[PDB]
Amino acid sequence: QTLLDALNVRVVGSGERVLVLAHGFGTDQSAWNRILPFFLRDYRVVLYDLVCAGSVNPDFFDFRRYTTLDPYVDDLLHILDALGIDQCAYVGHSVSAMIGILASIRRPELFSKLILIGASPRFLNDEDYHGGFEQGEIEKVFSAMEANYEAWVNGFAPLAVGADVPAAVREFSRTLFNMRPDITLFVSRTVFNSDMRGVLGLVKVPCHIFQTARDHSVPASVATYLKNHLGGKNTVHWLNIEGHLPHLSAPTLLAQELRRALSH
Numbered sequence: 629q630t631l632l633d634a635l636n637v638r639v640v641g642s643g644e645r646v647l648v649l650a651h652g653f654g655t656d657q658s659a660w661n662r663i664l665p666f667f668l669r670d671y672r673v674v675l676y677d678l679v680c681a682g683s684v685n686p687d688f689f690d691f692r693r694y695t696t697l698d699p700y701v702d703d704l705l706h707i708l709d710a711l712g713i714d715q716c717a718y719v720g721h722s723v724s725a726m727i728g729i730l731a732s733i734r735r736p737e738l739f740s741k742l743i744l745i746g747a748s749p750r751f752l753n754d755e756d757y758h759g760g761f762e763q764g765e766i767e768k769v770f771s772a773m774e775a776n777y778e779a780w781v782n783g784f785a786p787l788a789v790g791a792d793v794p795a796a797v798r799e800f801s802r803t804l805f806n807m808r809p810d811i812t813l814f815v816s817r818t819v820f821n822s823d824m825r826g827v828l829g830l831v832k833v834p835c836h837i838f839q840t841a842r843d844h845s846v847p848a849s850v851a852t853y854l855k856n857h858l859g860g861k862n863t864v865h866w867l868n869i870e871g872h873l874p875h876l877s878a879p880t881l882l883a884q885e886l887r888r889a890l891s892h
């Protein structure tokens with residue numbers, strides 16, 4: 629209840645079937661603004677801000693608490709229990725895909741299906757696994773972010789959007805620049821340190837894996853990896869959308885693909 633207020637929980641739409649939209653890194657729930665109109669007639673939509681969002685009071689971001697994805701999972705389950713949700717479809721972008729995977733292992737009855745967008749269980753390369761990033765490269769990123777946060781945002785946002793969609797570049801820049809820099813750096817280490825490979829097989833809920841073309845954060849092989857390793861019935865959607873942020877860059881097409889996945 630003070631948690632619902634703290635994380636800007638919003639419930640809209642005319643339907644009864646519950647659809648949770650959970651934003652990822654560098655954004656807030658406003659990233660779903662252009663999807664949302666397509667779900668109000670036939671869903672009950674639940675949106676919230678991760679505690680790291682620039683829209684959330686930075687006083688709530690307890691560095692002693694939010695050291696792994698688990699406490700983010702506790703926030704998500706607290707919200708669904710407080711709303712009296714006993715079953716939903718969940719859409720998680722970026723880190724929210726991994727949050728939803730973990731939540732479903734904790735509460736396998738709460739989710740009818742997960743829709744994962746721009747999802748990766750591991751970013752760092754090793755001898756047996758390609759995530760797309762070297763440890764040395766990530767360190768240099770953290771240094772740049774510390775040196776000049778604004779410059780870092782303005783250099784990274786075009787790469788994350790990927791396609792030449794200047795409105796989405798401005799929009800992602802906007803929400804990243806609203807995040808407090810100390811929070812952004814800490815969350816960025818949470819993201820790069822994540823390793824969800826050992827838990828994928830514990831998932832038993834069906835997963836739709838939405839993979840864009842030329843996603844700077846997620847090589848194509850990682851979407852294949854999720855399809856092979858998630859424990860339940862998996863479907864890969866190879867979206868006709870370029871870049872990591874299809875909800876910002878191609879909302880009308882992403883909305884129709886979500887509608888299709890949520891039907892069957």
Ligand SMILES: O=c1[nH]c(=O)n(-c2ccc(O)c([N+](=O)[O-])c2)c2ccccc12
Pocket residue numbers: 652653654721722723746769784788816819844845872
């Ligand atoms: O240089 C980066 N390259 C990246 O691809 N990411 C990143 C990794 C995972 C993601 O889900 C996102 N994202 O933008 O939602 C971004 C970063 C995430 C935080 C900080 C820096 C970076």
